[PDB]
Symmetry: none
Subunit: 142 residues, 2 copies
């Protein structure tokens, strides 16, 4: 199936506010001012029709290796945002692209590598960038 | 430098109305069409430059989009614009250290997209006012 998310997923003020507030709080705990996770490099070579699928991979990675491990932290917003993002992941579940995703895998791997290079603060940074994740999912999938 | 007091964003009513205004305008905008506010807007922009970046976007949107559409999208527009104008007023002349070229270039892209699309460009911009509001908050508080 084609990866996509109705725009209504990103137009509700309550959860959108919680998401941005969680990002702000985490960013205040992130001192890595030299690294950006969601940016040009992540999308390099990815065509518009594959962006949502790319974001699906970034989302699932962020859920499994960042948000879940940090799920009991950044209370109480974390506990409201995680279920929201997980539902989006579930909606995208198993959707795919009809083309080769080798370039997408490489771009995601670099993001994963960057988070590990940063260690714990890598996870903190990812949470601090939930605002960019939110906007990237919306922009690539609606 | 650019910054805004937390109090300025502790407005649940206006937040909800901003999202309603964005939803309404979004109805007339093709969702799968090009976007305006996103990661690309922040390309090469440090965290300390974000509020200044959003200030540019906020002012462009107010003067080139909202004011011109100030009589449409009632009754949402009539409440949101005054609020956004106040914030613009608060950010008066606040700026950054040296060389904002990368910032202006990123903003130029958003501006070109809106202008090339004419009226539809304005509608698209209003449809993304929710992202503008949230981005401004996180970049300036």
């Amino acid at each position: 199936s084609h990866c996509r998310l109705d725009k209504s997923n990103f137009q509700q003020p309550y959860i959108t506010n919680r998401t941005f507030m969680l990002a702000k709080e985490a960013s205040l705990a992130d001192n890595n001012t030299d690294v950006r996770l969601i940016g040009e490099k992540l999308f390099h070579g990815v065509s518009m029709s594959e962006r949502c699928y790319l974001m699906k991979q970034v989302l699932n990675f962020t859920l499994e290796e960042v948000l879940f491990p940090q799920s009991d932290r950044f209370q109480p917003y974390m506990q409201e945002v995680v279920p929201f993002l997980a539902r989006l992941s579930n909606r995208l579940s198993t959707c795919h692209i009809e083309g080769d995703d080798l370039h997408i895998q490489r771009n995601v791997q670099k993001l994963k590598d960057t988070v590990k290079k940063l260690g714990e603060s890598g996870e903190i940074k990812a949470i601090g960038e939930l605002d960019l994740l939110f906007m990237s999912l919306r922009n690539a999938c609606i």
